[PDB]
Amino acid sequence: LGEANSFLEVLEQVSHLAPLDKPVLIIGERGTGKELIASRLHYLSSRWQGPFISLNCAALNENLLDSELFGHERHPGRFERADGGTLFLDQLATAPMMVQEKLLRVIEYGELERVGGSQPLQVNVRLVCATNADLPAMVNEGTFRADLLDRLAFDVVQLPPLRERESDIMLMAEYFAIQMCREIKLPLFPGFTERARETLLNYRWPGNIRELKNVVERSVYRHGTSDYPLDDIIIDPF
């Protein structure tokens, strides 16, 4: 979430892309809300009453990924489960080259192939994928299929990292701090000192919004009082 102009521009882009049936590629670091953007593409589309299915490609080994996406024997895969809806594939760049070619087969031909006896399955799925890799760099290296990229990247949504939305950092920090005050029953958030603000604004936030929420919640809890402003931002609890 947030309100920097670069983020508002993303929301505008998403509102125009959502009604299309074309695949959308989301590029962004961890904690920038890629799955929320994918969900927004679905719910602003004509498919909104259909299924919204997610899969993280990085999480499964190659055989398990293959079966989870395309099914086997019956274990229906994620494409089948997303029929009439939207399938979100996260960490796309980790997909093995076998899975990449099979993904292209389903995209251009619009159907899954069955082992023996079973006829192929036709599927109608809107695809949204996400990564933080440099996919054109991977194409040059031969670790990502050029023909798949020629097809998947109809258009690209680039999510700005928190460090490039500096105006959003104190806005969101205040929001998360207030919510933590409610959780631990403090009567009022007593504010951030200038030292705290320097700490927040100078940090690069590799975990972006998710990390900001955790750091601020921990800091409010450790502070534990409404009697004076929060001075000590605990970035590293280790």
Residue numbers in the entry: 9 to 81, 91 to 255
Text lifted from the article:
Bacterial enhancer binding proteins (bEBPs) are specialized AAA+ proteins that are required to activate the sigma54-dependent transcriptional complexes. As transcriptional activators, bEBPs function to catalyze the conversion of RPc to RPo, causing the RNAP-σ54 holoenzyme to isomerize and promoter DNA to melt, leading to transcription initiation. The ‘Glutamate Switch’ pair (E-N) was identified originally in PspF as the E108 side chain adopts different conformations in the presence of ATP or ADP, forming or interrupting the interactions with N64 (3,11,16,22,27). In order to understand the biochemical properties of E108Q and to provide a structural basis for the ‘Glutamate Switch’ pair, we determined the crystal structures of E108Q mutant of PspF AAA+ domain (PspF1–275E108Q) in the absence of nucleotide (APO), and in the presence of Mg-ATP or Mg-ADP.
The crystals diffracted to 1.6–1.8 Å and have the same space group and unit cells as those of WT proteins and are thus subsequently rebuilt and refined using WT protein structures as templates. We first compared the conformations surrounding the ‘Glutamate Switch’. In WT protein, when ADP is bound, E108 does not interact with N64 albeit in the ATP bound or APO state, E108 interacts with N64 (Figure 6A, (16)). In the mutant structures, on the contrary, E108Q in the ADP bound state as well as in the APO state also interacts with N64. This conformation, which enables the ‘Glutamate Switch’ pair to interact, is linked to the ability of PspF being able to engage with its target, the RPc. The crystal structures of the E108Q therefore suggest that PspF E108Q variant could engage with RPc, irrespective of its nucleotide bound states. Such a conformation could contribute to the ability of E108Q to bind RPc and move RPc along the pathway of transcription activation despite its slow ATPase activity. E108Q, on the other hand, is hexameric irrespective of the nucleotide being present, suggesting that the reduced ATPase activity is due to a reduced hydrolysis reaction per se, and not due to gross defects in hexamerisation nor loss of nucleotide binding.
